[PDB]
């Protein structure tokens, strides 16, 4: 038998994305953030194309399709970035883009050093936990179905069904090569725990970007069109508690 699911995830996995950052200029907060915002914009495009091509994704109500994307983009991009950092530079730095790699010095200048160390720890997790390329792909797909609005979705039933299936596929990935149900359970524990630790980080980044937007005109930080729109219309909903993450643990 062949893995139809994993073949799809592997096939739709977006390629390298550049930030268009001028590494010839001395570092500065304005330039670093303004570049991260541009990077975010670019990656968003790929995140849309990626998601639209996910198994059973089109079964979701068109409105819910756009919603889960606007709520989880952060966690998805942070998770994907933590993985590039582990596979490209063995977590020595934050590999946001080939043309935008952060060392402690840059983490500091970005004024979000603590958050960055958080992401470095996340990057190292892929190592200590020995996260296979396949487990990663499935984990990322799942993060798109990890943050729902308290008032519920247009069609909350479909989402629950879809999300369920992806968890079912993650059970298969873990079940593969593992014959004992205890090690299967023990592994699910670790992955779900790892997937949860992504939310606190996303939250901090959500809050940080939110404030940055409000005082952007004062600190000379440029926000791309969509970025500003999402952060001012969707992000606030998460920060105000109207939209919440789905943790596996408490």
């Amino acid at each position: 038998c062949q893995p139809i699911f994993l073949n799809v995830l592997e096939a739709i996995e977006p390629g390298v994305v550049c930030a268009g950052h001028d590494n010839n200029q001395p570092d500065s907060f304005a330039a670093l953030l303004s570049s991260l915002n541009e990077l975010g914009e670019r990656q968003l495009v790929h995140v849309v194309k990626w998601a639209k091509a996910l198994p059973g994704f089109r079964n979701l109500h068109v409105d819910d399709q756009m919603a889960v994307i606007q709520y989880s983009w952060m966690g998805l991009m942070v998770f994907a970035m933590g993985w590039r950092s582990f596979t490209n530079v063995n977590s020595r730095m934050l590999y946001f883009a080939p043309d935008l790699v952060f060392n402690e010095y840059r983490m500091h200048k970005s004024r979000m050093y603590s958050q960055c160390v958080r992401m470095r720890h996340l990057s190292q997790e892929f190592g200590w936990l020995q996260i296979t390329p396949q487990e990663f792909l499935c984990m990322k797909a799942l993060l798109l179905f990890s943050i729902i609005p308290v008032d519920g979705l247009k069609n909350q039933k479909f989402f629950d069904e879809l999300r369920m299936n992806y968890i079912k596929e993650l059970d298969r990935i873990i079940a593969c090569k593992r014959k004992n149900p205890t090690s299967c359970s023990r592994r699910f524990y670790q992955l779900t725990k790892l997937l949860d630790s992504v939310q606190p980080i996303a939250r901090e980044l959500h809050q940080f970007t939110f404030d940055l937007l409000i005082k952007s005109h004062m600190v000379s930080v440029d926000f791309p069109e969509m970025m500003a729109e999402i952060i001012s219309v969707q992000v606030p909903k998460i920060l105000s508690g109207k939209v919440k993450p789905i943790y596996f643990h408490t």
């Binding site: 968003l44 495009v45 849309v48 194309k49 639209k52 399709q65 756009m66 994307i69 606007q70 069109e225 969509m226 729109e229 999402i230 219309v233 969707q234």
Partner: peptide, 11 residues
């Protein structure tokens, strides 16, 4: 949301 919508629409 109005810009993300157009992006979403045209893939």
């Amino acid at each position: 949301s109005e810009k993300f919508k157009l992006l979403f629409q045209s893939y």
